[PDB]
Amino acid sequence: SSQFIFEDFNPEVGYVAFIGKYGQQLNFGVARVFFLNQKKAKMVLHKTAQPSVDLTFGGVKFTVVNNHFPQYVSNPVPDNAITLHRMSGYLARWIADTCKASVLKLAEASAQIVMPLAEVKGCTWADGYTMYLGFAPGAEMFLDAFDFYPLVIEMHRVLKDNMDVNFMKKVLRQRYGTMTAEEWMEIKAAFNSVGQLAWAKSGFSPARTFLQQF
Amino acid sequence: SSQFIFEDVPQRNAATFNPEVGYVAFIGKYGQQLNFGVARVFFLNQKKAKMVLHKTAQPSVDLTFGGVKFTVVNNHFPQYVSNPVPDNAITLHRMSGYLARWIADTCKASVLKLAEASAQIVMPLAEVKGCTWADGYTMYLGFAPGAEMFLDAFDFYPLVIEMHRVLKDNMDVNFMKKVLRQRYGTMTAEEITEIKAAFNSVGQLAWAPAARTFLQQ
Amino acid sequence: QFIFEDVPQRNAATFNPEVGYVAFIGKYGQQLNFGVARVFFLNQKKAKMVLHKTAQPSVDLTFGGVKFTVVNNHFPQYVSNPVPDNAITLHRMSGYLARWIADTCKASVLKLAEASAQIVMPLAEVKGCTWADGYTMYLGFAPGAEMFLDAFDFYPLVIEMHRVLKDNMDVNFMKKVLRQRYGTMTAEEWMTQKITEIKAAFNSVGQLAWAKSGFSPAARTFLQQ
Amino acid sequence: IFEQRNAATFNPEVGYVAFIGKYGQQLNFGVARVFFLNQKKAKMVLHKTAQPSVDLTFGGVKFTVVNNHFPQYVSNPVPDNAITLHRMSGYLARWIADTCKASVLKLAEASAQIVMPLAEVKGCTWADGYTMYLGFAPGAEMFLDAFDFYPLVIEMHRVLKDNMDVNFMKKVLRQRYGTMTAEEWMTQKITEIKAAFNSVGQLAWA
């Protein structure tokens, strides 16, 4: 008894616009801010009333289309649009794009930024990049750029704790180079990488501690 | 079958139409402000612009692509296919040539800016035999007409990618005499570093039963 | 003597009933009658020609008194032009009028008679179709009918599933046909209820012989057909 | 009268010059007010002044005004960053609308002082929101995104309700939106007719 609502542009299309606005005027540091201020940044976005708030994350002003107002919870979100969620993944890609092969640039990003959702689950850069980034909301948008990692991470949310199908339905329509990932059945490094981060174990990061937890 | 004409052997003017003729476009004239946007429209309409000039009895015409305005020497209007073309000039083939380079070089530096090409830029003569963006910016931009004039900075992908066209699906086997003339920057060849190594690497592409069962008999 | 194209699949006009919706109750249906219909399909070919020549990307055509704003993507300069989803191409106009006829003469047999009397589809006579076969086949011949295979029970499909193996037409001119729904996810890939009545339209157009219509028992003991 | 566009975006390029750095520090409802009202006899004045580039004062501060009313100088070049009366209006509109966005107090001021004469004729007024009222401003058609597509649908009823030269419409049916592009079909439903369907709720001339 809920009851209706709802069901049925490339995720990499929206991405480009940023190279003309916010792209050229951006930095390797400001990301730390974001990933460490999004959850409270989302709280305020649900109280007020101005349909298209513009958020600041480091003197950097994003025209962030507002979503979590009960009024317009269900809207037609534009392709140019840059909602909190969408906006999060693009940072995850930008820094993913910079941390490909370039060992020089890689450590700089690893040292300065932290998406909490990764470390709380216990992963860290010490095991990859992509594995780590695939925790950021909006990472499910680029499973072709995060190898298939952010998809199965949500399994480990249904697995380790529990997550509904609704918090998985959106990720299960996403695409790796279109075609392939949205098919479900070529097991593209997915079923072998469900066993390569659950090996990192869940967030017991904070021993000789016997009381049932390991 | 539009032109730009030889004679019998090169001749010539520019022994190597490059660091002096590939900067007329590049950086220099027009090059001040051009975007992939401009590139996009040019490649998507090269066919149609090649169609129009052919009906134009004007020796040198002007073409506008997503804003920017190029003066192109019309060498496909029957009559004009012969007249001497300045190295200064920017016959459409040259333009696409220089245009292909502009993306090819500017991508080399930053990998995030090239993904914008991986979105905005489309090559029909490339993607129709199934080259796609996934298969490398060298190979995709390879089917962009004019690429021939750079086998070196482009990386030997214009000769090898055209060596299978007629060499599999016919063509007059003469067109290839245009490729057979280019260099690698004096002097790596002369016509290996790959070639055939790219053959069976570009041979992994397929021209294309999805729908139905063919002539259901 | 042409072809013309739209590209590609994920297109916004995947909703033929939408862009059909508008043609009538929307604009022109409010006025449409078998008159303007008979007058259209008759002079369809002419218009395709007139269009191919005139210097305007959109042109106002009149048929049996009706009116239309048609988008000219025939003039070879305007061929790859974008047609707005609710803009009526001469092809589309032809697909809709056919559906129109299909709809109104569906159920009302009083109407199916009158349609038969007034409406000639020159893309069917030359095959020896005629009404008695059924509107769901006879109007299925019309340009544009492939948009709505459902409406014509796959009949527009089999024309190029037959005038290739009973004459000569390109496989390039069939990705045109294939790509249109019928009832959503089910039957979008030639499937679902023994290939969704694969059969009763398959040979019907081959059983209705290609026909070489015209003169009759005109015999030539002269080596002929 | 001034005059795809032709290389000239009316936001970060010439909009940002219209505020902050040029004039954007000597500006307030004071000035804004005095301008929006008495444009008729600034249009019926530069119609005569043979000068190409006149300086007009509006509540004190002076602005380099570029004249394309007056027969002869009606189709010259108009340097880009050049700020004609019609432009000035547009940028000012965008400026006020922006000042009274979120700020509810600033909202209350602007309503008291500023009066848009084109808006009132047809029984608009602030009681119908700053995107409608200020929407009437000349040049607002440069910020369809910021004035909720009203400039568009305002100009549409003029053609419908009274019968204005339809040709005029051309300019509006150009920029469309802020980002891109001029697709009338994407976001032209609840929003578009909003001003044609939902907006005539307030009827025109009384």
Side-chain angles (χ1 to χ4, degrees), chain B:
Chain B
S1 183
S2 57
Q3 279 281 210
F4 168 135
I5 214 135
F6 42 67
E7 176 57 41
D8 223 79
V9 176
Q11 190 138 263
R12 184 190 331 301
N13 255 301
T16 54
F17 284 71
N18 184 331
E20 194 95 11
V21 206
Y23 293 93
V24 59
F26 252 120
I27 277 286
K29 187 184 182 179
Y30 312 108
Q32 177 213 222
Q33 172 54 52
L34 77 166
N35 28 289
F36 292 170
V38 185
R40 178 166 79 247
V41 47
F42 176 90
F43 290 137
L44 296 172
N45 288 284
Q46 181 149 44
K47 278 87 200 172
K48 188 182 154 182
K50 248 164 73 186
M51 211 83 64
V52 303
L53 258 75
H54 186 244
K55 289 180 290 179
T56 313
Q58 201 206 354
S60 172
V61 317
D62 286 48
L63 264 46
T64 309
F65 297 95
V68 43
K69 51 274 158 268
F70 309 81
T71 308
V72 204
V73 174
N74 172 5
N75 259 231
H76 26 256
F77 179 72
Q79 304 196 329
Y80 296 151
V81 301
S82 309
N83 69 65
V85 178
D87 51 282
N88 286 40
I90 184 190
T91 203
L92 213 39
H93 184 92
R94 282 161 194 242
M95 195 174 339
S96 60
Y98 305 146
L99 279 160
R101 207 203 204 276
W102 182 86
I103 317 152
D105 266 336
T106 207
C107 138
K108 249 87 178 282
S110 43
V111 278
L112 66 301
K113 88 93 62 79
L114 70 87
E116 310 158 17
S118 301
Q120 288 131 54
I121 302 314
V122 199
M123 280 257 50
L125 298 178
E127 215 163 301
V128 77
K129 284 226 163 193
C131 190
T132 153
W133 264 118
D135 291 35
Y137 58 98
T138 37
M139 200 171 88
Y140 192 79
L141 294 169
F143 305 78
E148 322 107 43
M149 289 140 64
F150 325 97
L151 189 134
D152 42 330
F154 226 105
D155 307 334
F156 38 69
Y157 274 108
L159 161 96
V160 190
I161 66 98
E162 192 219 287
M163 190 176 279
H164 212 49
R165 290 199 187 212
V166 49
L167 259 275
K168 180 190 186 180
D169 194 52
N170 317 292
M171 179 171 287
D172 304 73
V173 196
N174 302 113
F175 296 87
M176 264 145 45
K177 78 179 189 174
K178 202 166 206 291
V179 247
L180 277 27
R181 306 187 283 101
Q182 278 79 7
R183 310 170 180 80
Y184 208 103
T186 339
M187 203 78 269
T188 325
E190 222 299 329
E191 322 138 60
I192 55 192
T193 321
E194 175 130 310
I195 298 177
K196 201 186 182 288
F199 161 74
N200 267 304
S201 171
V202 73
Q204 292 178 77
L205 281 56
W207 183 98
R212 289 189 203 163
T213 123
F214 177 66
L215 305 171
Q216 184 75 3
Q217 293 156 4

Side-chain angles (χ1 to χ4, degrees), chain C residues 58-83:
Chain C
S58 137
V59 195
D60 288 343
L61 267 44
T62 317
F63 295 85
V66 190
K67 190 167 179 176
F68 310 105
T69 301
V70 188
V71 164
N72 185 3
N73 269 40
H74 287 268
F75 188 113
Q77 181 195 332
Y78 317 147
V79 155
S80 87
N81 260 338
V83 183

